[PDB]
């Protein structure tokens, strides 16, 4: 399980013209330092970037929930071998769109099996929308409340409002209570 | 269970002329960052926007309460198959209007069954009213007490009045005490 | 188990032009004093430098997880003898890319055995990317929030913001709960 992303965000899709109004190479260096700080706390994606979840063993036989939460259109399920013949499979599973648990529910059967050495990888385009105007606005507001902090103070210095950064991203974090075996 | 909304609010229905009096591209960017912050704490809708609850399995057989609370006029219950033949059904259930539990109570029978792969989806127009003058005024006041905070302070800085933002939205939040099995 | 690095970072790959904008021999002396402070807390590498893990006994027979977490392309597994005849082996194991546990899973067999005196060593190029623009931006932001502190205050003096240095590197640290026998 790696989940490295395919393509980074272009920077033309980030609202550097809107962030300037709220407060270009230094402004855009602070939104994506605040987009990546909010996604890492909320396990979200916010810009619909492409990913590659390359994992070695399926956790269940009708599961392996995806960590990046808002998903749509799993592109492929490439089932590689050790030498890398790279034969993709095209049937057997279903992307089940769910903000709670984005999972691969399969089709009433065990998920595609993995060769000895050949790690199965999933490429999917997960996120809210391709632009900035497609986000939930409070999660878009939480980026501006954090990126304006990184702009207005440079080192780790000192200064809680009712709906702050933490109170706006408390409802996008993954609420999990299983530290168990399954 | 996704519940992505069909159409966003136009912005012509937001009271940017009234918010200015209480204190246009920067004012309207702060109400919907405070409308979406209050709806996410109260699970409300406030502007009667359209939704699509696309879920994979019915929780009960005379239930599946809807999360967005003030509902009216469930438009359709589209019961799709895996290939997407998209055949809507038109009978068997009742929208039961309730601010506590907006639920589909069915008609003395099990709810419409879901095909293997074909996720059932519900499109409904939930909210108080189509304009801003149809809201409860305290929930309209709580938006202005929050959006004037986002206007008057830009990063997560420091500063509780008797009826504040939290005391006005404490009576619209969903009071739930079931973390159980059903 | 030593893990000394093969080649240090050149300094041409460090963003001394970007660090200056955020705030050259004194600036670059403060990023790598803040890169090495964050890698030592997060057990990461951040610049894809080359390493040599020279250890004396394999902890398991299908394991020996690597400590530096983001790995790619284990170059060789040199299996030396006591006099140093230096015969590398080329088969039997698999690099399993995992941010959680970068491990050598073997190939359904015990890992290559070590001679009496001849310590087995692993050379691998672990890290995110060869440049600075390939990092996760919050881990790149945490370097700038720390290196601007080392710039702006010289001795151990006095001064916590919501996403500070510690809140940004809390999600890259190795979360371990085994102080046991295996």
């Amino acid at each position: 399980m790696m989940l490295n992303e395919v393509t980074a965000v272009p920077g033309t899709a980030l609202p550097v013209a809107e962030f300037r109004d709220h407060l270009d190479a230094a402004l855009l260096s602070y939104l994506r330092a605040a987009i990546a700080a909010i996604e890492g706390r909320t396990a979200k994606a916010l810009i619909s970037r492409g990913f590659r979840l390359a994992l070695t063993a399926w956790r269940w036989g009708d599961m392996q929930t995806l960590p990046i939460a808002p998903v749509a259109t799993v592109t492929a399920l490439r089932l590689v071998d050790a030498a890398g013949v790279e034969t993709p499979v095209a049937a057997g599973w279903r992307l089940v769109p769910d903000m709670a648990r984005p999972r691969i529910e399969a089709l009433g059967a065990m998920l595609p099996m993995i060769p000895t050495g050949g790690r199965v990888e999933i490429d999917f385009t997960a996120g809210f929308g391709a632009s900035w105007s497609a986000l939930p606005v409070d999660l878009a507001q939480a980026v501006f409340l954090l990126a304006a902090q990184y702009y207005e103070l440079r080192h780790d210095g000192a200064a809680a409002m009712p709906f702050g950064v933490m109170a706006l991203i408390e409802r996008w974090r993954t609420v999990r209570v299983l530290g168990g075996r399954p | 269970m996704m519940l992505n909304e069909v159409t966003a609010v136009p912005g012509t229905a937001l009271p940017v002329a009234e918010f200015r009096d209480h204190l246009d591209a920067a004012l309207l960017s702060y109400l919907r960052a405070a409308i979406a912050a209050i709806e996410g704490r109260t699970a409300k809708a406030l502007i009667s926007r359209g939704f699509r609850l696309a879920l994979t399995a019915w929780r009960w057989g005379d239930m599946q309460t809807l999360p967005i609370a003030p509902v009216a006029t469930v438009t359709a219950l589209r019961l799709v198959d895996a290939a997407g033949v998209e055949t809507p059904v038109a009978a068997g259930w009742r929208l039961v209007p309730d601010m506590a539990r907006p639920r589909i109570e069915a008609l003395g029978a099990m709810l419409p069954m879901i095909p293997t792969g074909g996720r059932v989806e519900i499109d409904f127009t939930a909210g108080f009213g189509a304009s801003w003058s149809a809201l409860p005024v305290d929930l309209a006041q709580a938006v202005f007490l929050l959006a004037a905070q986002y206007y008057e302070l830009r990063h997560d800085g420091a500063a509780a009045m008797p009826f504040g933002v939290m005391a006005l939205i404490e009576r619209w939040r969903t009071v739930r005490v079931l973390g159980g099995r059903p | 188990m030593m893990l000394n690095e093969v080649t240090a970072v050149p300094g041409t790959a460090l963003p001394v032009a970007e660090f200056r904008d955020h705030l050259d021999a004194a600036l670059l002396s403060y990023l790598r004093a803040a890169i090495a402070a964050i890698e030592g807390r997060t057990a990461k590498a951040l610049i894809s430098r080359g390493f040599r893990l020279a250890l004396t006994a394999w902890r398991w027979g299908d394991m020996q997880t690597l400590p530096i977490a983001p790995v790619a392309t284990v170059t060789a597994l040199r299996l030396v003898d006591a006099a140093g005849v230096e015969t590398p082996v080329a088969a039997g194991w698999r690099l399993v890319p995992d941010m959680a546990r970068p491990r050598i899973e073997a190939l359904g067999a015990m890992l290559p055995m070590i001679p009496t005196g001849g310590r087995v060593e692993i050379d691998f190029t672990a890290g995110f990317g060869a440049s600075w623009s390939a990092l996760p931006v919050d881990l790149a932001q945490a370097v700038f929030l720390l290196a601007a502190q080392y710039y702006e205050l010289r001795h151990d003096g006095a001064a916590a913001m919501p996403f500070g240095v510690m809140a940004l590197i809390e999600r890259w640290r190795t979360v371990r709960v085994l102080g046991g026998r295996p």
Partner: protein, 195 residues
């Protein structure tokens, strides 16, 4: 319901022995800051001095010198025995109550009701075996008599059952010691042919 309690209270402890984390302790490493992880050069050292010198039966009591920042907080396991123990026995005794077996015969652990198996076995063959057998053999007697012509009776024989010997010997001692009536009159009281 008593089966569903005895199945689940026994599968309570089956699961609890298969998915439960007790530690013997925890070596808390806060560090110089409020939090701080310890390096892989220090985590390999901390395991080797915990595996070799501090774990096992042969290391039960090593002093475990703790530096600045390190700390050993020993965890307990406070409910150790008896997870649904007297409810599993109370359910297992309500199962035996329904079928009619006394709890002595199957071995359910409980306050003794019968004394010494001479009356636990005698109550078993009198309350829930011989009433059950005299209804099955009586339906065999009527149904099989619809096949041959003559009506037939077919009932349990108490004489050839070793559990009723404590019933039988106090009968034979009752009219055996009754010497006032004659010998041919006490053979007929026991079911013996007079000679």
């Amino acid at each position: 319901v008593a089966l569903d309690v005895h199945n689940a209270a026994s599968a309570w402890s089956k699961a609890l022995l298969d998915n439960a984390a007790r530690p013997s302790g925890a070596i808390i490493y806060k560090g110089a800051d409020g939090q701080g992880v310890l390096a892989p050069e220090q985590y390999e050292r901390l395991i080797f001095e915990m595996e070799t010198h501090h774990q096992g039966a042969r290391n039960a009591g090593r002093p475990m010198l703790l530096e600045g920042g390190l700390d050993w907080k020993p965890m307990g396991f406070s409910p150790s025995d008896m997870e649904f123990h007297e409810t599993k026995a109370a359910a297992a005794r309500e199962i035996a109550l329904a079928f009619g077996v006394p709890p002595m015969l199957i071995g359910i652990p409980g306050d003794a009701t019968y004394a010494n198996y001479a009356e636990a076995n005698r109550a078993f063959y009198r309350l829930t075996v011989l009433p059950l057998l005299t209804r099955v053999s009586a339906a065999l007697a009527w149904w099989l008599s619809g096949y041959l012509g003559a009506q037939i009776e077919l009932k349990p024989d108490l004489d050839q059952v070793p559990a009723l010997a404590v019933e039988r010997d106090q009968l034979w001692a009752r009219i055996g010691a009754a010497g006032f009536l004659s010998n041919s009159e006490k053979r007929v009281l026991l079911g013996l042919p007079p000679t």
